[PDB]
Amino acid sequence: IQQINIVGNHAFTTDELISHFQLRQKQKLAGDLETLRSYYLDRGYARFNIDSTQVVTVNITEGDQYKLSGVEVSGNLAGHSAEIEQLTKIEPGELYNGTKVTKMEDDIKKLLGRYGYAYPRVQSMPEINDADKTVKLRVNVDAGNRFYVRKIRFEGNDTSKDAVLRREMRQMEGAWLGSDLVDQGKERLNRLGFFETVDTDTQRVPGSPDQVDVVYKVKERNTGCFNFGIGYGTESGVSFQAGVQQDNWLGTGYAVGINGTKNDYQTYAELSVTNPYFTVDGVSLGGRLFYNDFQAYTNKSYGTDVTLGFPINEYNSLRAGLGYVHNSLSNMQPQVAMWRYLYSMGEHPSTSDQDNSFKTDDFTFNYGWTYNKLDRGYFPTDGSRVNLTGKVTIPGSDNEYYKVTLDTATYVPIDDDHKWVVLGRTRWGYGDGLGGKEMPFYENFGGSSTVRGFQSNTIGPKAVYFQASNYDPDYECATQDGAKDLCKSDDAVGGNAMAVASLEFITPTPFISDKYANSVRTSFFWDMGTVWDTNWDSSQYYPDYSDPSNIRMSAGIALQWMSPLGPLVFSYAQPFKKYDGDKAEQFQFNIGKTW
């Protein structure tokens, strides 16, 4: 790249123009010259012209700066004269701007579409006044005719039934075309996440000038997979896990999840079903039933819930529901981190004696609110999501409490192609007890869904050890044989307060897309957060568990890609800021069925 000269440039210096050039190659020079034209044209230089170039020197003629003199409106305008004026009113004496003129024309083209004028013809006719360096604008506005939509049909649906897609369009048959309204169907289908691609075709009806059809074409994406396996041997015994997940079960519009596992120590089973359209106008219902347990202590629980909800406007919805869970435990490792709650809740077990039990059957009410303007189902580029949910216990339950969880994320593009995007994510977790009691010990909040640089469920306050433990060695502090005093432990318990945030810089992967045809992104990330224990009695203690400022941090690189078996993700993190009880991790590899 060599020195670039501009001659005939007197209102500006060289850099004022060069900063918009792609050179600090001939085939693209016009795009900088047109930029140069806009630079001048958008500043009133109605006579600005490109005269010649040589290879680099650009020889230009600099004219004067023109003002607008006024605007004339003509053509087959079927009313809406005031609205047309709104698109044409200017401040007398304001600077001529060619882009503004084009914009005004496009605004007219758009405005008339909602009234059935699918194809208006609008032409600007600028007039240059040299006696008075101004431009007068005349526009010929031919509104055109009125178009009605006769049939709307879909092609390419092998699994989904049409009853689902016709729920998403806002343009309905038997009415005039709003050329702008049909396009919202693309967003609706994109939000469902059921398709590889969606597009549209507006076509004229050959039988008459006033009828059109609207055709949508989609390509269905795989909606879920079944996973089964059992680990079996003559020494291993039986280790079972299986389940199925479909987001559009055989295309019926229902979401179904069935999972479970069985082994010598823990049991899980959970089934959930939901219908996004119980009613024709979008009322949704669904719920689930679960069971689980653990055997060495012993802990068993089970429960169920049902949720109903509905949209309240084009972009927002509410849901709420009821359910309950039974909880029982016995022979649990004694822990003062729990005792100061259990005794506070009225429990009076022997101190440091594992031989104990506790069980309740607690009924609760849950609710939440969401906001969603995200523009894609898999690779968001714009919009944001807000998910505020929480639950409060139902009077008559044994554990009376409440908790609220907030999860937000925002995507803002940088470039016109949305190849680079700024992404923010934040988590909040707060709650408290009711009736003078404390929060459940099992509601405490590390992992791939949170600060990446630490081991899963390791962030926060740790347990301590102290009567009886009948295992023959492993901790001296756990038993009367070796314990002498209050002991530290690396066993995390989490806590009743959480604050976590992360930031990602999403970039394109042209060095990968050159080889692979699927959707792939890479991002740079930072994450950090902390968990703490509100009302921890630090006066008796050791680290202070009430301190909310002990924020820990990690950062690294994340990769996002789709595969035939569903989305998969991996990121590599490097922890940088840590506190005591550090249990770091860096290789985060898991299923991509997230976000």
Binding site: N222, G224, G231, Y232, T234, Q246
Partner: peptide, 10 residues
Amino acid sequence: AVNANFRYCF
């Protein structure tokens, strides 16, 4: 001894 598994997608 064995870790039998299979996958079927929808």
